[PDB]
Ligand binder design. Structure first.
Ligand code: ATP
Ligand code: MG
Ligand code: ZN
Lengths: 173, 196, 594, 222, 300, 189
């Protein structure tokens, strides 16, 4: 509730489709102060979309399949989890996937996401373990780092700091 | 829409958190974003006006049940989102202030008046805690386990003959001491000495 | 026999070296293996310290000893990574005296040498053979060959009746590596008297490819070998290690290479309350005054931010500066310093330039009889600054070729059946003199400038520098020059060239600020005021030679964004708008009013 | 049951490790902490008495170093407890507000912890009321609402994964496995699994399933 | 030789006080003589200028014999000596003289009354860099000190070349005199140690040789930031490595007594606060009367 | 707040060292404290120190042993497992069984570092050989850890005989990854 990343994740826009005729809800639409007809298609933030979908018999809104959980993205995930660039797809992919799974009680997406997370964490740990050495006194690391999601970035930072602290303590003069 | 200002405020909060994480030793809280919070509160007031108008229309008007329900729910959800964003921002700032207060034994222009009062009261509370049965321990002490009884230290900033509880240390700049770590731990903490 | 002992000695060196309590090379090899980087960098001083005999063996016959070292590295890597992997690459670092490129001769044949030069050309990656699968035509006998890339190998001449050369390579079962060719020129300062710069052919393998771009000074460690293209051999250099002062990897990739200790040095510097003054003082420390021009050069180096609209329209983000002034103003020295400090820069003379020189040239290959496109100063200086000295000397024809490059940041070529649109995202810093060599106040500005308005409109800031004979300023300048001739603050009031270049690269790759609504309102008000003033200033006799169009508004926006980027500030406020407006008034409106 | 200072120090170390590695806030060892503080006071007085009065130089250094180590351990333990109390103020307050709950903060916290909790809660509530809450409508003026879109009370992560080392009794729950080694059996309700913990083996279990063993001291967090 | 193991052989011979004294490397004739010597030893010029680590191993091994047979011709027979060399496992070997040179360089250039106090505070700070360099864990400090020593020796060589070419060393019967007024590196000579280094360089060169009667030397420098002098008296030295009954006897430094007597008798606000009583600070105006009185005293 | 972020949920290497130095160790006293002032400790036992005789094996706490060693008043008896022969046997055991970990002491790395830094002349075997053996053992264990990291799941996980320092190093990554897998599985239901 007070965790910053969770607040940001809930702000992403998801496709929606109203099922009732609600005058005066134009401010959600592009134009203000006009009635919104049924079946109208628009994107709403997750915080408003989820509650409107669950509450409202025929609810107020129907959550259409997003573009982040499409067949193309699933196939790319299955084909090459490590090479897939998740940041461009979304910066809160794992959080939004967990929320979607909780909302819809589905197991195929859960399996796919679990496999993707495990296969990505393998390389994440490899990179975190990899540490530099100063002989006098990179490219792949940064290339992979550019592809990471926010949660993966946090895990990478924690693990890298732990490894660095252990190495520093071990080799302190 | 409605939550864009709150989203921007939370983005700024994330920036502040990242700055705090990156910073090694010295941290200075950014200026309190008074204007954004003022705009958010004005938006909340507008939403309250909308809710009052909807209630009045329902009391005397042609509005039906479904429309009233949907509008009321949308307004309430928007207010909840704005409240959550404001509270998250304030909580992050308060946590950073709490860490700063604990770092000291017990500028401010960036803080607001409420935050300054909060910091003063928290420092008073920390001192009161230190005044209890834990007087033998120094709660606001070093969290690094003691390793060496005797260490070499070097004076970093000139100061007079400061009379500490353990003894009198005439801190002449660029002069080394071979003393116990416990005796000069506080001086190292304040930056007068250095372990080298 | 002896090869096994050499391999064992190298393995022992790898597995036993230690300077305090870390096995440097063991840990380095493990870390490199972790990230799929099959190589190992060895400092030759450590090798000398461990055992001088090993260094003597390595130096005596490098071409025969290095492969054994690679085999030892591979064996140690297999031991350390696999619990019971192609051949690893050896990259060397040394501090031996650098031999001038021209001093390389017969005496240095088949020896490890260190030299520095300028890369002028790079080739397309080729494919070399490491593991070859072969089969005999007649009896179909399967055989394999392992090839090292060090040349003092061929298909067997006799099968293992079958005719001469009976083996044919099976491709689908073979393994190949990458190879590249480079052309290295000698530094201009090291060239002997009255001699053309000399070129040298060089080759790199595997992890040393795609490491340098043309026009960048580099230091090379390699073997001075020869290859038979009858009593002569063509010299060439086998690269063993590349050391450059420019992070080419971070320039051609969105990826950025900066150590954690660097990133935190550049943040602390940015936190300085008066970084602007430090950078202004850090440019041309040997030139007196010209503070406004130094600030303009700082803005040009930092550059603005480029925006790509959803409709596809692209907005320029580079700042161009023109210097029109009297002789002795030190414009050429400023241009030389800008060329020296910028991460990428090319210094060119207008006089000695051409249309095909400065954009791209259709060139026919002598052998294939096919036409290719070479590149010119505005392709070689892509992502940097082009210093066009003697701008006025340039022919019309030549000049006219620059417009699209400056504005649209592209090069369009339709020649010899070649239809392409190259990319040239460069900033132009030009210096020129008036028509008569001095800005005669008696004559109108139009008579003092032969430049058409079309070219002038593209320059964001125009500086009309006039030499005024003031006794106090003259005495001050004379004292400064005398002190320079007869004669290191580094106390936070100035940073060296290397640090400034690194900071420029970091800022360009990290920040791209944006204008706030207040900045936009102020900028619109100022633009309206400036245009109204220009309209008022018009005289019936002539129309303003110095133009004020939408391009000047874009230029001011770019200057404000560059000022904001200077401090790594994600947003540009009115504080930067005021400085940008002051600079524009001091240079372009100052030129126009006169 | 007091035994000896060494056992008290061992128990203090065990409690410190468990608190550092535990997700929840564990009960306060009131008697042990009281004994430790009294012993620290007496030992400090003894050290002062000896010092006030060359073969005796080394023993005094040993006493002072030991005192510093014990003080550091207690300090770290108490600071971790205070941080946990900070993270669970609303949880707790909710615990106290309920009467059917068996736990009470008087048993779960020391007097200093109770005072700190109350003071910090009041101060933070005053700040957020003077800053934000006073503008929201009555429906949104509660700092702890559980019926909203997102619950504002942050409970501990019950199923957090932690490292454990099985030590066995210092046993009805103990049973032997096929290979003849003593073992413990625990269940994971969500996955309907059965996990066999072997004495002397390190595992990475969920905290909830190992909570009873940890409380009984049959396992210790690493 | 100057830092033989951390520089080139050519630099070692070039920046040595003894070699310059016995060959006069401050003009072209000395350089020609050095080149001729290197050519007769059989070491190519390119090989000689190569750094010590990467120099050809055959020449490095033969260096002892090569010196044994060739140094006598040019009068450098005294370069042969026995010293102490310390080595650590898999690290370079450094001799005692080179270590002392690095420490002194760190002490010297490591990094009205108010400016003097600030300068002395800076020197006190440099003391701790020198102290840290003595540890085996802090080798980067030692390497930095070696580099600073090279730079300082180069600067002192340039200053000495300027002094000797201009013939600034006035010769009075009682003593020699040399005053620096408009050099290029006047700032470096505010530290007494750097001034003593330059004085030793000048004493060994053209004075220890030439068969000239031993005479104490006066070296003075000027700093514009404070407008005062740093006079340093230097005792004469016998030819190096010349065992004799008169060389066995030492030469005392009488400048402290004369300086104190002149200061007490005269009125020039002189400073004798330095531990080395021969080094004093003199106001800009008073140096001429002070030197007049020194010449007339005859107690040197 | 009261506790920094890097000290949350994990121990710093200094804390691990502090935990290690509480264990006993064998020493050879170079003085005769026993009578034929008095240590009065409240955290450990003081009987052993008082009844200490010259060149007679006795057991004390590791930090007290190091304090005595600093004064050159006691020679630390190195652990039996820290011999070249025993380390070679452990390396052989690791090589022969790619699935398990050797039964090294839970404090072998920390104790080895402490003894190498503080007690260099006490070891009977050359220090460099011991350093090499420890390095080889560490690399083999790292290979095994990397191989075993592929089986992270929402359910439990077993890592037997893994030392304290390695567990401390791996705690963040393993804990977070397993927590996220458990969260996904719980959401699936
Ligand atoms: N302010 C100054 N400080 C130092 N040197 C200066 C200054 N102004 C001029 N000079 C010197 O005057 C000489 C002028 O030559 P330079 O090529 O720099 O001139 P320019 O302004 O480009 O003129 P031109 O139009 O004649 O080519 C250079 O040596 C430059 O160093
Ligand atoms: Mg010019
Ligand atoms: Zn055949």
């Amino acid at each position: 509730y007070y965790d910053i990343d969770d607040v940001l994740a809930d702000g992403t826009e998801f496709p929606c489709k109203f099922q009732y005729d609600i005058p005066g809800l134009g401010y959600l639409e592009n134009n203000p102060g006009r009635p919104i007809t049924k079946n109208t298609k628009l994107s709403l933030p997750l915080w408003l979309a989820r509650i409107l979908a669950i509450v409202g018999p025929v609810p107020f809104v129907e959550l259409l399949p997003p573009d982040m959980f499409s067949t193309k993205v699933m196939n790319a995930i299955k084909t090459d989890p490590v090479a897939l660039d998740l940041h461009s797809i979304n910066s809160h992919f794992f959080s939004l996937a967990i929320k979607w799974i909780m909302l819809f009680s589905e197991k195929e997406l859960a399996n796919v996401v679990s496999e993707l997370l495990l296969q990505r964490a393998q390389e994440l740990n490899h990179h975190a373990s990899s540490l530099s050495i100063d002989l006098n006194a990179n490219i792949a690391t940064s290339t992979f780092l550019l592809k990471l999601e926010e949660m993966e970035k946090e895990i990478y930072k924690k693990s890298h700091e732990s490894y660095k602290d252990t190495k520093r303590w071990m080799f302190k003069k | 829409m409605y939550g864009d200002l709150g989203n921007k405020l939370v983005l700024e909060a994330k920036r502040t958190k990242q700055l705090y994480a990156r910073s090694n030793q010295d941290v200075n809280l950014p200026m309190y974003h008074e204007d954004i919070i003022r705009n958010i509160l004005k938006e909340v007031s507008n939403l309250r006006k909308n809710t009052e108008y909807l209630k009045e229309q329902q009391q005397l008007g042609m509005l039906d049940d479904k429309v009233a329900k949907c509008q009321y729910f949308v307004t309430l959800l928007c207010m909840e989102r704005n409240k959550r964003c404001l509270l998250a921002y304030q909580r992050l700032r308060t946590d950073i202030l709490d860490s700063m207060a604990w770092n000291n034994n017990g500028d401010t222009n960036n803080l607001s008046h409420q935050e300054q009062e909060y910091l003063k009261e928290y420092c008073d509370l920390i001192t009161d805690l230190k005044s209890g049965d834990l007087v033998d321990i120094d709660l606001s002490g070093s969290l690094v386990p003691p390793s060496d009884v005797f260490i070499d230290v070097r004076v970093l900033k000139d100061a007079g003959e400061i009379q500490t509880e353990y003894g009198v240390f005439n801190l002449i700049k660029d002069s080394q001491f071979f003393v116990r770590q416990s005796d000069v731990e506080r001086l190292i903490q304040q930056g007068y000495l250095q372990k080298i | 026999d002896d090869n096994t002992e050499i391999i064992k000695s190298f393995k022992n060196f790898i597995l036993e070296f230690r300077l305090d309590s870390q096995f440097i090379y063991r840990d380095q090899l493990r870390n490199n293996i972790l990230v799929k980087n099959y190589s190992l960098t060895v400092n030759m001083e450590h090798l000398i310290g461990y055992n001088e005999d090993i260094y003597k063996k390595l130096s005596d016959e490098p071409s025969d000893i290095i492969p054994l070292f690679e085999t030892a590295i591979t064996q140690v890597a297999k031991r350390i990574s696999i619990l019971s992997l192609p051949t690893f690459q050896l990259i060397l670092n040394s501090n031996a005296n650098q031999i001038p490129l021209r001093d390389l001769d017969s005496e240095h044949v088949s020896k490890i040498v260190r030299l520095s030069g300028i890369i002028i050309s790079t080739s397309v990656l080729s494919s070399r053979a490491t593991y070859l699968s072969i089969m005999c035509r007649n009896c179909r006998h399967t055989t394999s060959i392992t090839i090292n890339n060090f040349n003092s190998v061929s298909l067997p001449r006799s099968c293992l009746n079958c005719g001469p050369d009976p083996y044919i390579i099976i491709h689908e079962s073979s393994k190949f590596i990458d190879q590249q060719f480079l052309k290295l020129q000698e530094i201009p300062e090291l060239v002997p008297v009255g001699e053309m710069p000399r070129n040298l052919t060089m080759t790199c393998d595997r992890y040393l490819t795609n490491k340098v771009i043309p026009g960048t000074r580099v230091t090379i460690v390699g073997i001075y070998s020869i290859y038979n293209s009858v009593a002569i051999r063509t010299p060439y250099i086998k690269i063993l290690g590349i050391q450059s002062d420019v992070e080419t990897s971070s320039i051609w990739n969105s990826v950025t290479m900066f150590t954690e200790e660097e990133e935190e040095e550049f943040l602390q510097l940015s936190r300085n309350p008066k970084l602007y003054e430090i950078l202004t003082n850090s440019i041309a420390p040997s030139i007196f005054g010209n503070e406004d021009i130094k600030k303009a050069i700082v803005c040009l180096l930092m550059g603005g931010s480029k925006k790509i609209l959803p409709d596809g329209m692209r907005l320029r983000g580079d700042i161009n500066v023109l210097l029109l002034g009297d002789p002795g103003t030190a414009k050429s020295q400023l241009l030389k310093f800008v060329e020296k400090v910028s991460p990428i820069a090319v210094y060119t003379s207008g006089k000695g330039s051409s249309a095909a020189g400065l954009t791209a040239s259709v060139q026919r290959d002598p052998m294939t009889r096919e036409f290719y496109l070479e590149g010119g100063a505005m392709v070689l200086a892509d992502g940097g600054v082009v210093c066009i000295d003697e701008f006025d000397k340039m022919r019309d024809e030549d000049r006219v070729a620059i417009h699209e490059a400056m504005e649209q940041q592209t090069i369009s070529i339709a020649k010899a059946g070649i239809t392409t649109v190259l990319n040239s995202r460069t900033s132009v810093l030009a210096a020129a003199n008036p028509i008569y060599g001095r800005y005669d106040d008696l004559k109108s500005p139009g008579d003092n400038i032969d430049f058409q308005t079309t070219i002038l409109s593209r320059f964001d800031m125009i500086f009309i520098v006039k030499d005024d004979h003031n006794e106090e300023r003259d005495i001050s300048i004379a004292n400064h020059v005398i002190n320079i001739h007869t004669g290191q603050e580094e106390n936070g009031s100035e940073i060296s060239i290397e640090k400034m270049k690194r900071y420029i690269t970091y800022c360009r790759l990290k920040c791209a600020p944006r204008l706030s609504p207040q900045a936009a309102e102020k900028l619109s008000s100022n633009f309206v005021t400036i245009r109204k003033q220009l309209l008022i200033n018009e005289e019936s006799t002539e129309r303003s030679s110095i133009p004020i169009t939408i391009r000047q508004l874009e230029a001011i926006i770019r200057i404000t964004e560059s000022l904001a980027k200077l401090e790594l500030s994600p947003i540009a406020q009115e504080r930067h708008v005021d400085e940008a407006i002051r600079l524009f008034q001091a240079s372009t409106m100052d030129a126009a009013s006169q | 049951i007091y035994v000896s200072p060494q056992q008290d120090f061992s128990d203090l170390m065990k409690s410190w490790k468990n608190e550092r590695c535990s997700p929840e806030l564990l009960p306060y060892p009131h008697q042990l902490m009281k004994r430790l503080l009294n012993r620290i006071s007496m030992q400090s007085q003894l050290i002062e008495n000896i010092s006030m009065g060359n073969e005796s130089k080394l023993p005094l250094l040993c006493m002072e170093t030991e005192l510093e180590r014990l003080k550091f351990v207690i300090r770290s333990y108490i600071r971790c407890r205070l941080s946990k109390i900070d993270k669970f103020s609303l949880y707790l307050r909710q615990l106290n507000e309920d009467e059917n709950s068996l736990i009470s903060l008087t048993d779960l916290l020391s007097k200093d912890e109770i005072k700190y909790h109350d003071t910090h809660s009041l101060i933070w509530l005053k700040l957020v009321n003077d800053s934000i809450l006073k503008y929201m409508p009555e429906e949104l003026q509660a700092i702890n609402d559980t019926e909203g879109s997102v619950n504002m009370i942050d409970e501990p992560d019950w199923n957090k994964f932690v490292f454990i080392h099985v030590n066995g009794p210092p046993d009805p729950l103990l049973q032997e496995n096929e290979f003849g080694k003593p073992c413990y059996t625990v269940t994971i309700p969500d996955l309907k699994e059965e996990v066999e913990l072997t004495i002397g083996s390190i595992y990475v279990m969920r905290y909830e399933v190992i909570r009873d063993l940890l409380r009984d001291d049959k396992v210790a967090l690493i | 030789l100057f830092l033989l193991r951390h520089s080139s052989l050519y630099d070692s011979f070039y920046y040595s006080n003894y070699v310059n004294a016995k060959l006069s490397l401050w003009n072209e004739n000395g350089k020609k003589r050095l080149h001729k010597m290197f050519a007769r030893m059989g070491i190519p010029l390119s090989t000689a200028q190569e750094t010590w680590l990467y120099m050809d191993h055959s020449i490095k091994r033969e260096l002892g014999i090569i010196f044994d047979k060739n140094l006598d011709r040019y009068g450098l027979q005294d370069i042969i000596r026995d010293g102490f060399v310390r080595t650590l496992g898999y690290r370079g070997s450094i001799s005692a003289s080179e270590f002392v040179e690095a420490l002194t360089a760190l002490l010297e250039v490591g990094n009205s009354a108010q400016k003097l106090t600030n300068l002395r505070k800076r020197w006190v700070s440099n003391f701790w860099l020198s102290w840290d360099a003595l540890d085996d864990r802090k080798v980067e400090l030692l390497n930095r000190g070696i580099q600073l020593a090279q730079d300082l020796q180069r600067a002192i060589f340039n200053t000495g070349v300027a002094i000797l070419e201009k013939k600034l060393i006035k010769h009075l019967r009682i003593y020699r005199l040399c005053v620096l007024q408009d050099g290029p590196d006047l700032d470096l000579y505010r530290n007494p140690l750097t001034l003593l280094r330059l004085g030793n360089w000048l004493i060994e060169c053209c004075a220890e040789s030439e068969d000239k009667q031993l005479l104490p030397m006066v070296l003075a420098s000027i700093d514009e930031n404070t407008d005062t002098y740093l006079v340093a008296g230097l005792t004469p030295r016998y030819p190096r490595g010349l065992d004799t009954i008169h060389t066995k006897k030492p030469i005392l430094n009488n400048f402290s007594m004369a300086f104190q007597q002149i200061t007490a008798e005269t009125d020039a606000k002189v400073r004798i606060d330095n531990f080395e009583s021969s080094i004093i600070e003199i106001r800009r105006e008073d140096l001429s009367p002070f030197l007049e009185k020194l010449t007339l005293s005859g107690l040197l | 707040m009261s506790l920094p972020a890097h000290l949350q949920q994990t121990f710093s290497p200094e804390e691990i060292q502090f935990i290690v130095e509480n264990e006993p160790i064998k020493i050879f006293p170079r003085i005769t404290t026993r009578q034929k002032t008095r240590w009065q400790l409240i955290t450990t036992d003081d009987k052993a120190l008082n009844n200490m005789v010259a060149m007679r094996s006795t057991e004390v706490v590791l930090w007290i042993a190091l304090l005595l060693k600093q004064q050159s008043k006691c020679s630390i008896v190195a652990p039996q497992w820290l011999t070249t022969k025993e380390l070679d046997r452990k390396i052989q055991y690791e090589k022969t069984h790619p699935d398990r970990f050797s039964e090294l002491p839970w404090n072998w790395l920390v104790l080895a570092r402490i003894l190498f830094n503080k007690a260099k002349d006490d070891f009977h075997d050359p220090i460099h050989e011991l350093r090499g053996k420890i390095q080889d053992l560490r690399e083999i264990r790292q290979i095994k850890v990397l191989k075993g990291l592929k089986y992270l799941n929402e359910s439990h996980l077993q890592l037997d005989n893994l030392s304290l320092l390695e567990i401390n190093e791996l705690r963040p990554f393993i804990t977070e990854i397993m927590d996220k897998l458990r969260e996904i599985h719980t959401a699936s239901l």
